[PDB]
Symmetry: D2
Subunit: 251 residues, 4 copies
C-alpha cells in the first residue's frame, strides 16, 4: 500500500509543489487549505487524474484559538479517513506580514495568526500525528533561513519561526523512540509575496550569491522529498537551509 | 533622578534577586507578580525601608488571552505612574512544566500559559515599553542556555524560549534607532524547583563543569546588571549564557 | 561524459562508502589515501571491475607543511589527469585523537589542523582555480559545540572547517561552485575504541540507540552533490540521530 | 597583592584599551607586542608612571612555527617573572588580511600567520597558562561577531576565528575543574583598519543599527573587564557579542 502525507497550506506556491512532488514519489496526499478552495480542489483533480483516489482536500483555519487543537486533530483524522494511514506531515502553511513594535487587525489577532500558523498549529498537528501512530514516519517543518537576520518589523513572524525551530528539536528528541523523525527545510528567498512590488523582489534577488535568483518552489520541495526519503533514515532534528547562500551575506 | 525598572515575576528566586540588585544600583522598581502577593509586598517593604518611594508592586496574569495586551500596557503604565519614567524592562516571569506530545489543564491552556508567559507577554511588554518612548534604555529577556538541547517533553516551554530569542533579536534590530538596547541572559541550571529532591538537584549539579553546582539567583542578576549598565552601551541582540559550561557538555 | 569526484581518505570506513556510492551514482572517482594503499587499490579494483577506467588512487600526506599546497594541487591534478575534469571534491580525510591542555604538540597542530581544515582549504583553492554541477562537501562534526573532553585541536579543526564551508560557499557562489557539509554525530566508531565505550555512545542516540552506518553518511553526501540540491550552498546537514539534541 | 594579566597585541588599538582598563581596575599587565615596540614601551611607561612596577613589555612573533609553543610558554613565563602570578590571559593579537580562493606572501605563510595568531597561539598560550597555575583565573578570547556572515575572500582569517570559538568552548569545558573560566568577546565593527579609506569606514558604520557607528575600543574593553570580574564567576564558554546589532542585519 502507498504511504500518505498531509501538507498544510498546499493549494499554492511551495506547499503545492511539495504536494505535487510527494505525489510523484508515490504518496497519497491530504491537501490542506484555508481560503484557497478553488486552487486546492483543482490540485486534487490534477493529482487523482494521474492516480485515482490519491488526493483529498481538507479545509482549516490554523489561527490560534481554543478550537485549534480540534482543527489540527481533524486534519490528521482526515488523512486516516481518506487513506487509512498517515506517514508524513509537512507543516508549510504560514501567515507572513509586518507587526511593528512602534505605532487593520488587532494585535491579539496578529499574535493568533502569526504564532498560530507558524508554531502552535505545527505543535498541535505534530501531537495528533504522533498520537495516531517497514514504516518511514517523519515530519518536515518549513522554517526560515533568515531567523537570526530577521526582516525589519516582523517580530511576531520571526518569533513564530524561532518557535518552529524549538519544536523541530524538541519533537525530534521526544518522538525518536517511536521511529518518527522531525526535520526542517529553511528557504531563504523563494517564491516572493504576490503583493510585493517588482523593485523589492529584484532587490532581494540581487542579494543571493548563488545565481542572484530566488529558489523555485521545486527546489524547496526537493529538500523535503530528501528528508522524508529512505536516504535520510538517520536524520532527525536537522534543518537544511535551501537559500543559495543568502544567510551568509553580511549587511 | 533615579531610573526605573520593571521586573516581571519579581516576588521570588531569580526575579527577586534581579529587582534587589537593580534597586541596590539605584533603580526604582516595579515588582510584578501573579500569585505571590505576600512575597512581592514583603520585597517592596524591604526595598522602601532602604529608600522611601522606590518600589511598588503590580499584579497581572501573563497567560496569553484577548486581555493580555491591555494587561502588559498597564504594567508599563504602572511604572510611569509610580516613577515618571521607565528605563528598564526585565522579562523574567515564566511558566514551566512538561507538555508531552503523546499520551487536568487542557492543551490550549498550556499553550496560553507557556507561550504567553515566555514569549507573547514579553513581546507586548516590549511594544508598550517602546511606545512610551544621559538616558540608557534597555530590555533584558530571561532566556535559556539549554534551548538547543531541550528537556524531554517540554516542547511548549522550549518553543516559548526559542520565540524569546527571536524577539530579543527582532526587537534589538527594530528598537536600536530609539536607543533601546535588547539583550538576554540565559541560565543553564540556576535555582532548582522548590519541591525537587536534593538527590535530583544533584543530578543536574553534577553535570555543571564549573564547580558542579547551580548558579545563584545573584549570579544571574549580575549579568542583567551588566547588560543594563553604562558598560554595555554598544551591546544589543546579545544573549549571555550564565551556565557554568553546562551547555558544552555532551550527553 | 561522466563527472568525476575526489574523495580524501577514501580507502576505508566513511570515505570508502562515499566513494562507492558516488561510483554507483555514475561518478568516476579518485580514491585518495595516505597509509592505506592496499585498501585503496582493492577499492579501485572492485570499482573498475564494475566499470573499466572509472577509479584511480592518489597518495598524499595531508599534514600541514611547506609541501601541503603542492600535495593538494596534485590531488586535484590527478583527477584532471585521469578523467579530464573534476566536478566534486569530498573533504573526508581526518586525523582524530586527544590533545589535552594540561608526538610534539607542534606535530599535533600540523596533523589535526592540517587534515581537518588546512588541506580542505588548499584542495578548495585548487579545485576552484582549475574551473555542469560543481560542488564541494566537507565532513564536519555534529558535536562541534558539545565537544569531546580534551580534543581541543580536533575541535578547532572542525570549527575551522565550518568557517571554510561558509566562506568558500559565499566566495565560490559566482562560479556555480556549491559548498556544503555533512556532520555525523556518531557513525563508525574508532577501531581502537573499547567495545564498552562504543556501547556508551550508541546508548545516547535517540533514533535507534545505534551509530550511523557509513552508507547513511554517504546518502547525505549523495544528496548534496545531486541536481536535487542545486540551490543549497553553505548548508551543513547533521546526520546524527538526534545525538546533538541530547543534554548532559 | 594585585593580580596580573597578559594581553597579546596590546601596543595599540583594542589590545591597548584592554590593558589600560585592566590596569585601572588594579591589574599588573604584560603588554605583548610584535613589531610595535615604540607604542608598547610608551604604553608601559604611562602605566608605570601611574603605579610603578605594574607594566612590562614582551616581544613575540605569534606566527605558527615549530617554536611557537616555546614562544607562548615564554610569554606566560614573562608574567610570572615580573609579577609572581598570572591571573588573566587576553588573546587579542590577530593577523587580518584577505586570502582569495581564486587568483606577496606564500600561502604557507598566510596560513601560519592567520591560523597562528588567531587560533594556534591562543591554544598554546592557553596550555601554558593552565599548566602554570579565593582567586579568579580566566581567559578572554577576542572573537568576531561576523564569523557566520563573513567578509568576502577572508577564508583563512575566518577559519582562524571559527577555530578560536572551538578553543573557547573546548577550553572552558576542560579547564573548569581548575577554576579557569574561558570566554570570548566578539566585536562586529570596532576601530577600522588604519589603511581603510574614510568613505569605506562610513559604509560599515552606516550598517550598524545602534548608532550607525563602530564600537570604541573602550566599549570592547568593557566587556572583557566584565568577563574577568567577580560579576562573571559562573560564566564560562560564553561569547559576548559587542556589535551594535550588526550581526542581525540581513544583506
Ligand atoms: N516564500 C519564501 O521566500 C519563504 C522564505 C522563508 C520561509 N518560507 C516558508 O516556506 C513556507 C512556504 O512559503 P510560501 O511563501 O509558499 O507560503 P505562503 O504562500 O505565504 O503561505 C502558504 C499558505 O499558508 C496558508 N495560510 C496562511 N494563513 C493561514 C491560516 N490562518 N490558516 C491556515 N493556513 C494559512 C495559506 O493558505 P490559503 O491560500 O489556502 O489561505 C497560504 O496559501 C512557509 O512556511 C514560509 O514561512 C518561505
Ligand atoms: N531556574 C533555572 O534554572 C532557569 C533555567 C533557564 C532559564 N530560566 C529562566 O529564568 C527566569 C527566572 O527563573 P525562575 O526559576 O526564578 O522562575 P520561576 O520561579 O519558575 O518563575 C518565576 C515567576 O514567574 C511567574 N509566573 C508564572 N506563571 C505566570 C503567569 N501566568 N503570569 C504571570 N506570571 C507568572 C511566577 O510569579 P508568582 O509567584 O507571582 O505567581 C513565578 O514566581 C525564567 O524566565 C526562567 O525560564 C531559569
Ligand atoms: N566516524 C564518526 O563517528 C565521525 C563523527 C564525526 C565526524 N566524522 C568525520 O567524518 C569523516 C570520516 O570519518 P571516519 O571515522 O571515516 O574517518 P577516519 O577513519 O578517522 O579517517 C579517515 C581517513 O583519513 C585519512 N587521514 C588521516 N590522517 C591523514 C593525513 N595526515 N593525511 C592524509 N590522510 C589522512 C586516513 O587515511 P589512510 O588510512 O589512507 O591513512 C583515514 O583512513 C572525518 O572527516 C571525520 O572527522 C566522523
Ligand atoms: N577592529 C575590529 O573591528 C574587529 C572586528 C572583529 C574582531 N576583532 C578582534 O578584536 C581584536 C583586536 O582588534 P584590532 O583591530 O585592535 O587588532 P589589530 O590592530 O589588527 O591587531 C592587534 C595586534 O595584533 C598583533 N599581531 C598581528 N600579527 C602578529 C604576529 N604575527 N605575531 C604577534 N602579534 C601579531 C599586532 O601587534 P604589533 O602591532 O605589535 O605588530 C597588532 O597590533 C582582534 O583579535 C580582532 O580580530 C576586531
Ligand atoms: C524575513 O525575515 C524574510 C526574508 C526572506 C523571505 C521571507 C519569507 N517568509 C515567508 N513566509 C511566508 N509564509 N510567505 C512568504 N512569502 C515569505 C517570505 C518571503 N519573501 C522572510
Ligand atoms: C530544560 O530545558 C531545562 C534545563 C535546565 C533548567 C531549566 C529551567 N527552566 C526554568 N524556567 C522556569 N520558569 N523555572 C524553572 N525552575 C526553570 C528551570 C529549572 N530548573 C530547564
Ligand atoms: C567528539 O567531539 C566526537 C564525538 C563523536 C564522534 C567524533 C568523531 N570524530 C572523528 N573523526 C575522525 N577522523 N575519525 C573518527 N573515528 C571520529 C569520531 C568518532 N567516533 C568525535
Ligand atoms: C569580516 O569578516 C569582518 C567584519 C568586521 C570586522 C572585521 C575585522 N576583523 C579584524 N581583525 C583584526 N585583527 N583587525 C581588524 N581591524 C579587524 C577587523 C576590522 N575592521 C572583519
Amino acid at each position: 500500500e502507498a504511504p500518505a502525507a498531509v501538507v498544510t497550506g498546499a493549494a499554492k506556491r511551495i506547499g503545492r509543489a511539495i504536494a505535487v512532488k510527494l505525489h510523484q514519489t508515490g504518496y497519497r496526499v491530504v491537501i490542506h487549505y484555508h481560503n484557497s478552495a478553488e486552487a486546492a480542489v483543482s490540485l486534487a483533480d490534477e493529482l487523482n487524474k494521474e492516480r485515482s483516489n490519491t488526493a483529498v482536500v481538507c479545509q482549516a483555519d490554523l489561527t490560534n484559538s481554543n478550537v485549534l487543537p480540534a482543527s489540527c486533530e481533524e486534519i490528521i483524522n482526515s488523512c486516516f479517513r481518506a487513506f487509512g494511514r498517515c506517514d508524513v506531515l509537512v507543516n508549510n502553511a504560514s501567515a507572513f506580514y509586518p507587526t511593528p513594535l512602534v505605532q487593520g487587525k488587532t494585535v491579539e489577532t496578529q499574535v493568533a495568526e502569526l504564532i498560530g500558523t507558524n508554531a502552535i498549529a505545527p505543535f498541535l498537528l505534530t501531537m495528533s500525528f504522533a498520537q495516531r501512530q517497514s514504516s518511514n514516519l517523519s515530519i518536515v517543518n518549513l522554517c526560515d533561513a533568515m531567523v537570526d537576520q530577521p526582516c525589519m518589523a516582523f517580530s511576531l513572524y520571526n518569533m513564530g519561526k524561532h518557535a518552529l525551530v524549538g519544536l523541530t528539536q524538541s519533537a525530534a528528541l521526544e518522538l525518536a523512540p517511536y521511529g518518527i523523525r522531525v526535520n526542517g527545510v529553511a528557504p531563504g528567498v523563494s517564491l516572493l509575496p504576490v503583493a510585493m512590488g517588482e523593485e523589492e523582489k529584484d532587490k532581494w534577488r540581487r542579494k543571493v550569491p548563488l545565481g542572484r535568483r530566488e529558489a523555485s518552489a521545486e527546489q524547496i520541495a526537493d529538500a523535503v522529498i530528501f528528508l522524508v526519503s529512505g536516504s535520510a533514515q538517520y536524520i532527525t532534528g536537522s534543518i537544511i537551509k535551501v537559500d543559495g547562500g543568502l544567510s551568509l551575506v553580511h549587511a
